[model samples]
Target: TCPFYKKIPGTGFTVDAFQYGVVEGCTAYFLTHFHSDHYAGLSKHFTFPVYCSEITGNLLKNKLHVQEQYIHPLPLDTECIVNGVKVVLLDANHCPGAVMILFYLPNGTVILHTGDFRADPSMERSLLADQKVHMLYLDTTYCSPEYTFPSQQEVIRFAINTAFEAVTLNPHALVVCGTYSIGKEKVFLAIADVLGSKVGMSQEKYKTLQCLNIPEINSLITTDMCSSLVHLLPMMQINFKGLQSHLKKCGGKYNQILAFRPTGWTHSNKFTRIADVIPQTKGNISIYGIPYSEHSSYLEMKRFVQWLKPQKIIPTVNVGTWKSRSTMEKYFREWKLEAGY
Candidate 1:
C-alpha cells in the first residue's frame, strides 16, 4: 500500500501525512488543503510545523484549534527552502486553500504533488514556465475515459440559473443546496449574490466561512434556517427521504422544496450509476443532481499528463484493491498508447 505520507528518500520533507500518524521525525509537513481526507489526522495537540496556504493556516488555527507556532503559511508562487529542499506553492484550483506543491531537490530533480486540483489554463502556463518535472504525484480521482464533465464555473452558472428559475416558479419554495462543509463555498456565495438572498448554514459552517473573512459571504451567512429563502445544507443531510421528512415537519408553511447536489459523480455513467441532472421528485420535494466538481475529469487528467510528460507518474489515490505501482502503470500505458505518444 502506498502510504498517505510521501517522504523524499534522503530529505526529511514529507507531504500530507499528519492524518496518517506519520508526523514524528519529519523535517516538515506540507498540507494541500483542509479536506477531511487530506487533513485526516491533524489535531490541535500536534507539534510539528506545517506548510500550507494562508487561508488553510487560518482554518487550521480557527477551526481545528491548531497552535499558531505549528502553522506555516506558504504564499502562492513564493519559493522557500525546507531542510535543503526548495519548495513552492501554486494554486490547485480545487478549493480556497488548495495548492499544488513543487519540490526542487538539491540533486537537480523536481517533483510535483497535485493535491486534488482541476487542471486549469493558468496552471498549465505556470507549469510550462517551470518546465521538466522529474516526478509527478497525480490526483487520479477520475482516471478513466468515462468521466468527462464541464468545468466548475459552468456548473455554477447552471446552478445559479436553475435556482433562480425554481424560486421564481414557486415564490414560497425553499431552494436547498448540498455541499461539503469546506467545499462549494463559491456556489453558496454565488446563489446569495445572484438571488439577493441571505443563505442559511449550520453554526459550525458559518464559523469556518467567517474565518475566510470574505465580505460577500460574511454578509450573507446566517444560522437561522427560516431567515433565508435559500439554505446551504451539508451534502450528507440532503437525501430525498431526509428532505421529505423535513418538509413534513414544516407543516405546509412553504409551497415546495427544491434541492440540488453539485458533484462530478452525476456525470459518471458507471461510478455513480446516474446520469447528469436527473431530477427526482416525490410529493413536495424535488432534487436535481448537477455536475459540479473540483477534481480534474478523465480527459483533463490525460491532458495534464500529456503536457507535463513526467518521467514517472505516481497515482496519489488507491482505487479498489489495485497496488499503486500497478494502477499507475495501467493508466500511464493506456494514456500514452491512446495518444500514440
Candidate 2:
C-alpha cells in the first residue's frame, strides 16, 4: 500500500520503506530519511544497495550499523544515474539530511516523492523552472484545514523569547524544552545561543548531534544537568506525569520547571497566531505549546499541489482505511476550488 512503498508501474525502482519481500529483487532502492517509520525493515544485514543523502548514510552506518558496502551517498541538487534512471536529490527541509527524491523515468515522465517535508521557497523556485511532475507522493500529516499555524521561523522566535521571559520571572525554575530524538535541533540551539548557556541532554542525544558534525550544535551540548539553564528533554517527556517523574529523579533540586513544546498542534482555535503562547500549568510546572512544525499546513499543502499540478495525488499514510482516503479526497477537492484551479 501507499504507507509502505510506492513503485513506478512496470519499473523495478521503489521508494521509501519496503512492505513486501519482493523488494529483494528491485533494480534500485531509495530512502527518503532516517525516520523509524520510513526505514522500518532496514537493518545491518540488509544486502540490497540503498541510496540516500550523505548525512543519512552516516547515520545509517554509525547509528544503525548498516554495512558501508551497501550504502550510496547522494549529495543535494546533484543528478546521478541509477539503473538507467535519472535521479536528483533536493533538500526536504524537514530534518537534518532529509530530502525530496525526483525521478525521470525512461518513458519521459517525471515523478516527485516528497518523503516528508515542509515547503521551501528556494526549492519551489527551482522546481518551477524545470520539468513538470507526472505524479506526486505527498505527506498529508496536517492535511486538514484545522492545522493553520504560522511558519516555523516565527514560532522559533516566540519560543526563544518566551524562554527568556519565563526564566527572568522565575529564577529558581529550570527551563525544559521538548524535542524529538532527531529534528528540532534548531530550536534548542537558538535557545542556548540567546541565553548564553549550554543545553543538557542524554549521552545518546549528544552522540546523535555529534554525528551530524555541526560545529554550532556540538559547542552547545553538555551532559551536566545543573551546569545549564535549559534542559533539552525528549518530546515524550513534556507531559505532566512525565515532568513529575523527572523532578522526583532529581531529588527536588529545582522548585519549579517551565517546559516548552514547539509544535503546530498548538493552534486549536482558528484565530490563534504564532505569537500566541498557550500555557497549561500543573503544580510547580508550566507547559507552553508553541506553533512550530516541519510539515506543511493545510493551506501550504494546497498551494504546493496547485503549483506542481500533478496528474495524480497519492496519500502516503493510512491508505488501508477508506475513511482516511475520503477525508484526503475531500481536502484535495476543497483545495482545488479555493485555488481556482
Candidate 3:
C-alpha cells in the first residue's frame, strides 16, 4: 500500500502523508488514523505538529510513544481552525480511531481526504456528504469493477453465523479468528457474544485496543486460554501451516481446527450466493475466509466518487507502478465522464 502522499495544491496541509523526510510547503501534518502505513515516518523524534481524532491521538501517545506536545487530537464533526485553514474530522467507519478529514482552505478549496474507509449509509446522510468538494483524496484499496463486495452488515452477519455454526458442529475444536491489531475487532467480538463467551488475546494487544474506549470489547477480552473457545490471533497467521502448527502445539486438548480469516482479500469476482461468500475447507482441519472487509468495495468506491462529484480525485492506494496508476486514472477519467468534472 504505497500512499502517494500527494499534498493538496494551494495548501500547505498534507493528510496521511508521513512517509519520507518532509513535504516542501507542509506547514501542518494531519493523520487520518492510527494505521502504520498512514503514520509511517511518525515517532518520538517527529518534530512536526500532528493532528487527528482523540482516540487516534491516544494511540500515538501510547503505541507510537509520540510526545504529547506534537499530538493535537480534534473532536469528531467539529470545525476548528488549524493555523489559518478550517478543518473537520468525521468518523471514517473503517477503524476505531480512523477519520475522513475535511479541510477548508483560504483559496476557496474544499478538500476531503478519506484516509481509509468503508462507505456507509450513515456517512451518506451526514452533512459531509453534501459538500461541494474540490479535491477528493480517496483510499482506492478495492478500486476496480472486479472488487464488488457485500455490505458490512451482510459480512458481519455471515461472520457471526459462520462462527456460531462451526462451533456447534465442531464443539471440541478450537475456534481461532484472525484480526489486525486494530480493525476487524467487531467480527470477533460479535462471534464471542454469539457464542456466549469472551475471546482470548494477549495483554499487549489488549492495551492498544483499549485506546478505542470500546467498553464492551474491553470487558470481552479474556486472558485464560481455556475459558473461551474463540481465540484471536494475528491476521498473517490464518494460513494452513499456522493452523497446523498451532494445533500441534495444543496437542490433544482440541480435536480439530476451525479458523475464520476475516478480510476482504479473498474471492476474485463478486460473490454472495450461499454460505460461501469466501473460501472454506471442510477437511479434518477446516478454515474459512470470511469477506469481513473494512475497506469499501469497488461499487461502493464508484458510488462515493459519483455521490460527492468532486472536481479532482487523487488515489492513495494501489498506485505504485505507472500501469496501476494509469489504470486508476483511466477509471477516474471514465467516472468523471459519466458525471462531468
Candidate 4:
C-alpha cells in the first residue's frame, strides 16, 4: 500500500467516496479520476451510481468492462445537481479524465474539492479566473516546496533520453518502464518518434488517445482488447509473443527497444518469469521516475490556499499531509483578530 494511507483517517469513505458523500449525501458514491488509489475499490459490486468524465467512462468500460448503468457522465465545466447538492466539474489537468469539483451549497458556501491536480500553466490561469471560492479542499500530494517537480515537457525529454541511451548501449536488450495510461502515453509518443511511426496501442489506450485529440500518433491492433500498448510490435512484424519474447528476438539486432508500463509490478517480475530476459547489452533499462503526478505541487497548494484565504484549508487527501485544517483555522483567526476579514 502507498505510505500516505497511514496519515489518512479511517473515515469509512475513501477520499473520493468520502468527498462524494459530503456533497451528495447519498450512500452511493462517485470518483473523479481513474487512478487505482482514487477508484480502486469501485467495481460491479457497488451498484450505486459512479460519475466521471467521458474519457473515464470509456476507459472503465473498455478496460474493466464496468456496466453503463453504474457510471454517470459529466462534461468539463458543467454543473449538475445530484441529491440536492450543486456540483460543477473543472479541468484539473492531471490526466484527461481528472477533475476538480466545486460544490455550491444551499447555505451560500462554495467548496472547491480538487481530487488531484498539478499546477500546470493552464491550471493557474483557470483558477485565477474563478476567484470566488470559499473553502478550498486541496490535494496536498506535494505540500512542501522541496517536493516540487519539473514540467511535463522536461520529464518527457528525460524519458526519451533514457530510452535512447539504453538502446545505444545495448544492441540486444529489453527496456521496460512503468507508468499509468495517461502519463505513460506521453512516453510512448516520445519514443515512437525514435522507434518510427509503426507504433502500436492497447485497445483501451487507443480509444483514449483518440479522444485526447493528440496530433500524429500511430495506432496498432492488439492481440486482445485488454492487452497493453507496450506489447505491440513494429508495423512490419505479423505478431509478437508478449513483450519479453519480442525483446529477446531482436535483443542483439537493435541497440535497445523502449517500452513503458502502467506499473512497476510487471517490469520487476520479468527476470523471475524468464531466465534470459535481461537488460540491453550496452544500455540498461531505466525507470524515468518522473513525477507525472495528477496532484498539485506544494507551491500551487500554497497559492490556492492563500487565494481562497478560507476560514479553514482542509488538506484531505493523504498523498502528502501539509498543515492541518485546525492550523489553517488558527492562522485565519490570528489574522482576522488583528485586521478583520
Candidate 5:
C-alpha cells in the first residue's frame, strides 16, 4: 500500500477512506490488468467506480463472478477521462485483458502505470513513443538477470504440439488441462481451434464463455478446421484412479490410452498423481512444461528502469504501513545487485 496523499487541490486525506476517493473526487477507478493482484481488490473494496478493458471486464464479471454495480468497461487502445484524469490504454501482453495506463495529470506530469507488462516488440513500440512520460509505476516481478521467460505464444505452441503428439500416440485417451480461469482460456481455445475436434470445456469455463456470448466450443468433429486434436476434461474430473476407471468404461481395455491434465490443476494429490506423476506411463501422457511469464525479468526490468531513469522508484502493494524509505533502500540494494544504481 503506497502512502495515500492528495495530489490535487480541494482533496483532503482521511483514515476512513484513506482519502482515496476524496483525493480523486470521483469514485471512478481504472484498472491496468485482470490479474488477481489488480482485480482482487475490486472484489472487496467497492469504494470507487471500476473501469477495465473489455476482456478484463468480462473476466471480472464472468470468471471472477463479481456482480458489482460500479464496474465500467473500455476497449483496448482507447482513451477516457475518469475522476478528472485522462487515461490512455496500451497493450500489456501479460494476459488477456492486461493494459498499461498512461495518465495525463494537470501538473504536466504524465504517469505510466504498468501492470505486468512484457517487452513484446509491439508493446515496446507503443511505450516508446509516449512523449510526456514523466514517471513510471512498473511491474518488477522479475527484476533480476538470472531469470528468463519464454513468450506466451511459444508456450501455447508447445502445449499444442505436445497435445497433438500425445493424441496421435493414443486415440482413445482423454486429455485434461489445468489453466488460469481468465487468461489460459485463450490458450485452450487456440489449441482447440488448431485441432478442430470437439474439445471438452469445464463447466466453469463453459459458463464464462456463455457470459461472453461465445458458443460452446467443444472439439468439432470436422477435419476441415485443423491438423490434429484431443478431448479436454475439467481439472476436477481428472484423477489417476478415476481416469483409469473412466477409460476402462469407455472401452480402453485394448486401446492405447492417454488421459492428462494441464499444469494448473490444484484439487488434491489424486489429480497430480494421475495427470503429472505418471507422464511416462498411461500411454504417454505429456506435460508441456513451457514457460509463460507475465512480469518483466531481471534484465527486462533493469533495461526499463534505466531507460525511464526516474529520480525515485516506488513499489506498491503491502499489507500494512508501507515504509517507502526502507523499501527504497531495499530496491537500491537490488539494483546494485543487478549492477545498476
Candidate 6:
C-alpha cells in the first residue's frame, strides 16, 4: 500500500499526502509527522502550503528542505484557525513531532485524524473528552489481534537490561543499536545513559537530534568513534554481515559486537510472552530483536475506537490492497458493535 489513503473526504485537507497527487480541490496539505512515509512526496518546489506540528514543521524546513513560507508550524493542544476552519494539534504518542490532527469544521463536524500513534490509557483524559468525533482516520498498522506485542516501556526496559548485562559480561563488547531517523530515540538514549558511555552516529543524525533539542543528546553523541564503544545504526545495516563488516571496519575498536534491533514484527501469536524472546548469534556477533514498535496494539486500538465512538472509521495504512482493507473494515464494524450501538 504505497499511498493507501490520503485525502480526508468532505474537506480539502489531506493527512500526510506528500507521496501521491494533491487533488485539484485540496486546500492545505496536513502532515501528521516527519516520518519518511508520511512526508514521502515532499519537494523543495511545491505549489501548496503545508501545515504540521511545531517540531515536525521545523524538521520539514530543515530535513525535507521545504520552503519556510510554504510550511506552517502549529502548536500542540492549542486551537488554531487556518483557512476559516478550527483545528487543534494533539499529542500523537508515537514519534517526536507527531500529532493527531483535530479538525472541527464550520458545519459542526469533528474529525480526528490519527497519523501514526500509540493509543494508550492517558488519551481518555485529553482535550478530546468533550467533543463527539464524527469521522476517525485511524493508524491501523497493527489492526489485527494477531500482531499483538508488549508495550514500549516493557520492551525498552528489556533492551536496556539486556544491553547492560551484555556490557557487564564483556566490557569491550561493542554495543550497536538499530534505529530510524526519528522513532526509536528513547531506546538507544536510555541504553547509552544507563551504560554511561558516549554513542556514535552520523553527523546528519546528530543535526536531527539538535533540532529535537533533546536535553542530554548532544552530550551523548560524539564525532570521534574512537571515544565510544556504543554506536547507532539503521535496521537495514544491523544484519550479521553488516555487523561483521562494521565490527572489522571500525579499526579493531572492540572485541565483539552486541547489537539490538528493536522492532514490532518480531513478536506474534506464535511466540510465548517475554521469556520466550531470544537473541540470534553467529561467531562474534549477537543481535536481539525486541518488540519495540511505536504503533498501538490491537487491544489498544479496540479500546480507543470504543472510547471515541466515531460514526465512521477510515484506515490510513495497509489499506491499498483489497483484502487487507476488507479485513480492517470488518474489524471496525465488529469493534463498533462490541463498543455499543
Top candidate (lDDT) = 6
The TM-score, computed over Cα atoms with residue i paired to residue i, of candidate 5 is 0.68
Q: Candidate 2 vs candidate 4: which has greater lDDT?
A: 2
Candidate 4 per-residue C-alpha lDDT over 65-173 given as tens digits, one digit per residue, 9 for 90 to 100: 6788887778777768866666777887777678777766677767676777775556556634565666666676555445555456765666667666655666353
| Backbone clash count, each prediction separately | 1, 0, 0, 14, 14, 1
Cα-based lDDT at residue 115, candidate 3: 89
Q: Residue 182 CA error for candidate 2 (Å)?
A: 1.0
**Per-residue CA lDDT of candidate 5, range 1-341, in tens?**
32442122222211112223333443555666655545544453454556677766777676655675766777666667766666677777666677776767767777676656775545546644656465666565544344555455665766667657766666653554555444555555666665555555446655555444344543332222122234445455555555555456544432443443444222333233222333545443333333455666556666666555554554442313446445544765676556554
Cα-based lDDT for every prediction: 0.78, 0.79, 0.80, 0.53, 0.53, 0.83
User: By TM-score, is 5 or 6 better?
Assistant: 6
**Candidate 6 structure quality by residue, lDDT tens digits, 70-95:** 99988888989988888999998988
lDDT (tens digit, per residue) of candidate 2 on 26-134: 7777889888878877888787888999888988898888999999999888778988788889888888889988888898888888989887656677644478888
Task: Please give the RMSD of candidate 2 to the true structure.
Answer: 2.4
Off by over 4 Å in 6: 1-5, 267-269
lDDT of 3 by residue, 234-284 (tens): 878888888788777665778777788766766543555435555556455
What C-alpha lDDT, on a 0 to 100 scale, does residue 195 get in candidate 2?
Answer: 80
Among residues 3 or more apart in sequence or in different chains, the pairs in candidate 2 whose N, CA or C atoms overlap within 3 Å are none
- Report the lDDT of model 2 for residue 260: 84
Give the poorly placed runs of model 5, Cα more than 4 Å off.
Answer: 1-26, 41-47, 61-69, 210-286, 316-341
Model 3, residue 255: distance off in Å is 1.5
TM match of model 3 to true structure: 0.91
lDDT of 2 at 77: 85
